[PDB]
């Protein structure tokens, strides 16, 4: 596939997440913004990479549907989130964020929606606690990146720019946390509609 450039940040077509050794391709990328006082403040640029094997898996079930169709289909993105393949997310900050600011916002989203499905055990709370522990002292100037590998486990890595380090920072062995992080971005209530549309556009075409 092709590379994508989002808000002056470049996402190449392939990456090598640090922990894994599988091949990944850029499924899509998009900005993430919030609405404050009449203005859409763009905070991050998100790149969603998928393991190569995701194309045959998704091609079987989502072939013959237009990009417009896939964007609305909620089960299409749930398959991207939960499929039996690795996912890698790059979150590059457009505006500066502290790790506490980032993890707290990640935290409530993940905890509340887990209460939606009545799957919130005391284990996920421990996963959340570790997640917050990873981010506690981190700071993320413009251009720095938060890297997530979602594996059938969540691997967390940090970079001061857009490059991928050779060694992660932490691994959290929880399947729901690893999935929630990605759901919070490209899910039904996903904070990056633009990443969803990029994913819809690029994967449907790949299915051809």
Ligand X SMILES: O=C1C[C@@H](c2ccc(O)cc2)Oc2cc(O)cc(O)c21
Chain residues binding ligand X by CB under 6 A are: 32, 43-44, 46, 91, 97, 101-102, 105-106, 109, 184-185, 191
Tell me the closest approach of the beta carbon of residue 149 to ligand X, in angstroms: 14
Tell me the closest approach of the beta carbon of residue 95 to ligand X, in angstroms: 7
Tell me the closest approach of the beta carbon of residue 59 to ligand X, in angstroms: 27
Cβ-closest position to ligand X: 184
Residue whose CB is less far from ligand X, 149 or 184: 184
Residue whose CB is less far from ligand X, 42 or 65: 42
Q: What is the DSSP string of 123-176?
A: HHHHHHHHHHHHHTT-EE-TT-EEEEEE---EEEEEESSSSPPSS-SEEE--HH
State in Å, rounded, how far the first CA of the chain is from the last one. 13
Residue whose CB is less far from ligand X, 185 or 200: 185
Looking only at the bridges linking them, the beta strands covering 39-51 and 154-159 are unpaired
Tell me the closest approach of the beta carbon of residue 19 to ligand X, in angstroms: 19
Tell me the closest approach of the beta carbon of residue 91 to ligand X, in angstroms: 5
Residue whose CB is less far from ligand X, 46 or 58: 46
Q: How many CB atoms lie within 10 A of CB 67?
A: 15
Decide: helix, strand or coil at residue 188. Answer: coil
Q: Which residue has the tokens 């606690």?
A: 129
Tell me the closest approach of the beta carbon of residue 60 to ligand X, in angstroms: 29
Residue whose CB is less far from ligand X, 32 or 202: 32
Question: What are the angstrom distances between the C-alpha of 55 and each of 49, 59, 144?
Answer: 12, 6, 29
Helix 193-207 × helix 175-186 angle, to 10°: 100
Question: What are the angstrom distances between the C-alpha of 97 and each of 64, 78, 94, 163?
Answer: 41, 28, 9, 18
Residue whose CB is less far from ligand X, 54 or 146: 146
């Amino acid at each position: 596939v092709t590379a994508l450039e989002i808000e002056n940040y470049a996402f190449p077509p392939t990456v090598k997440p640090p922990g894994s050794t599988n091949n990944f391709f850029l499924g899509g990328a998009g900005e993430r913004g919030i609405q404050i006082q009449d203005k859409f403040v763009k905070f991050t640029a998100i790149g969603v990479y998928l393991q190569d094997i995701a194309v045959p898996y998704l091609a079987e079930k989502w072939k013959a549907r237009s990009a417009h169709e896939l964007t609305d289909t909620v089960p299409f993105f749930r398959d991207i989130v939960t499929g039996p393949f690795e996912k890698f997310m790059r979150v590059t900050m457009i505006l500066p964020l502290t790790g506490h600011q980032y993890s707290e916002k990640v935290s409530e989203n993940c905890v509340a929606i887990w209460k939606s499905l009545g799957i919130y055990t005391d284990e996920e709370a421990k996963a959340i606690d570790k997640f917050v522990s990873v981010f506690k002292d981190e700071t993320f100037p413009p251009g720095s990146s938060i890297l997530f590998t979602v594996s059938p486990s969540l691997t967390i890595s940090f970079s001061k720019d857009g490059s991928i380090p050779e060694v992660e920072t932490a691994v959290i062995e929880n399947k729901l946390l690893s999935q929630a992080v990605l759901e919070s971005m490209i899910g039904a209530h996903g904070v990056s509609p633009a990443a969803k549309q990029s994913l819809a556009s690029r994967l449907s075409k790949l299915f051809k």
